[PDB]
């Protein structure tokens, strides 16, 4: 039996909205330490990693480790049936043939109870070696979303050049070209060991920014030749990290 109660149920609503466009199906690894999800998109160009720590929940119990296979579109649909101030409880029996989801409000007048079928997935897990990066940019999440949206109307790739004093985003296509310069100051801060210059597919960045409602800040971590990390903190709980392989 697994059971986790989250009073700030809107966190789960936003997590699923931030996932369902990038990936269809994923395995939720539950253990006594928390919830972990790790999945590559079908094209193997990006990977998303979700961490929700045990201690972030209001009640949390894992009698035994589980790997639930979930259609994220279906779970997304169910979570749209929760109000933004609902208390959300997740709950899975020994068999784990279904995931139960309970939506409540402190006044308790509407209680909703959903049962969704799980599925069998090759749970293929993978690891990320904790590194430091040449450049780490912390900036408002809304600003980064706007940059990625605007530049995607210029071209389909963005060159991210990071220096000690600022970060630039550049794109070009048939219309012409464009460059957006951000200065270190809604703070923009840059921790740089060395300069970097990387190119990334804008279509994937615009999937990542569906996580923007989870945090007013976003962090970009870059080094030569390695995937970009785009991380949104889920306050008092964990994070949503997106990995994007550079071009060439």
């Amino acid at each position: 039996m697994f059971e986790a109660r989250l009073v700030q149920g809107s966190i789960l609503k936003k997590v699923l909205e931030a996932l369902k466009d990038l990936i269809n199906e994923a395995c939720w690894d539950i253990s006594s330490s928390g919830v972990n999800l790790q999945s590559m998109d079908s094209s193997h160009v990006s990977l998303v990693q979700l961490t929700l720590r045990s201690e972030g929940f209001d009640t949390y119990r894992c009698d035994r480790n589980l790997a639930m296979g979930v259609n994220l579109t279906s779970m997304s649909k169910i979570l749209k049936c929760a109000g933004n101030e609902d208390i959300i409880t997740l709950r899975a029996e020994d068999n784990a043939d279904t995931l139960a989801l309970v939506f409540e409000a402190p006044n308790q007048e509407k209680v909703s109870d959903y049962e969704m079928k799980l599925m069998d997935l090759d749970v293929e897990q993978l690891g990320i070696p904790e590194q430091e990066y040449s450049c780490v940019v912390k900036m408002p999440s809304g600003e980064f979303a706007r940059i990625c949206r605007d530049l995607s109307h210029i071209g389909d790739a963005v060159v991210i050049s990071c220096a000690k004093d600022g970060v630039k985003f550049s794109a070009s296509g048939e219309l012409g070209n464009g460059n957006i310069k951000l200065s270190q100051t809604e703070a923009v801060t840059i921790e740089m060991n060395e300069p970097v210059q990387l190119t990334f597919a804008l279509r994937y960045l615009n999937f990542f920014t569906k996580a923007t409602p989870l945090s007013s800040t976003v962090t970009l971590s870059m080094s030569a030749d390695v995937p970009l990390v785009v991380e949104y903190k889920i306050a008092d709980m964990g994070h949503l990290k997106y990995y994007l392989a550079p071009k060439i």
């Binding site: 590559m40 094209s43 193997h44 990006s46 990977l47 993978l126 392989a245 550079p246």
Partner: peptide
Amino acid sequence: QTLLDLFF
């Protein structure tokens, strides 16, 4: 355009 298990 690269891919990812390539990287891990």
